[PDB]
Design a protein around this ligand. Sequence first.
Ligand SMILES: [Zn+2]
Ligand SMILES: [Zn+2]
Lengths: 146, 146
Amino acid sequence: LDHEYWMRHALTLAKRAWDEREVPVGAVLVHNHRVIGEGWNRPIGRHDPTAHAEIMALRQGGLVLQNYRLLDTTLYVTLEPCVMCAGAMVHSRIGRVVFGARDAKTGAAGSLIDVLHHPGMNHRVEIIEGVLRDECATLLSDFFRM
Amino acid sequence: LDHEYWMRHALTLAKRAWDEREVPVGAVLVHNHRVIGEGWNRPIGRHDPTAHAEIMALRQGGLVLQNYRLLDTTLYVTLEPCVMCAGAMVHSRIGRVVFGARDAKTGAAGSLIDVLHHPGMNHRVEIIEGVLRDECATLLSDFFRM
Ligand SMILES: [Zn+2]
Ligand SMILES: [Zn+2]
């Protein structure tokens, strides 16, 4: 579905997070080839431990759809989702998550844990990884070097 | 620390959720024996898949402390936290979670999965279960009967 076109927008949002001095992750939630939520990482600034990119984008999606269930959506994100965000995607009943770089240490879509296909969740999210992978990694690498 | 006194307040918040026709879960975040966040379940009403009791209470706590890290806090909740909320508690670096009833099917503190002591998280949350257990269960049972 030209996943790079949507990931590019996510990288755009990640660079907002970068300008805010937050770990640079961006996310966009797409429904019928239209954006219905955007998010970027801002826990430090918002004083909000839950203010990850995915959480912000899933919340917008709910407002836009007037529904807490976000059926058949695709969530794009520049980094593999953490446990908190992976659980949110499961509650949201999204169709699919597409991510850029793996989070080898604490990623929760097959890196540390695979919450999205854990055998007791009432909903399965499909996974596609590595979209604009090197672009997503370099943002995060330059961040940590900084 | 008279955990029933704080759980009673959580049950108070859970009954707000009940009056809103939402699964009746309440939560309170306590720091130095003072409440610094309250929460109750309202996904349906807020059109927000992330709007669980714990998420709302952890968010308030961050505002009150002007910090996304909520060190040495105790989060009380009427039901075992789900994967999404268990991950949030880990990111928040809370000291302890105290819960009422187990969620046998999808609870993420030793029921379905134990996210809070999973061997790769950078932070361990202590767990105490069963506080006002029967009170918490009956609320949820009456809800599902309804
Ligand atoms: Zn996350
Ligand atoms: Zn939850």
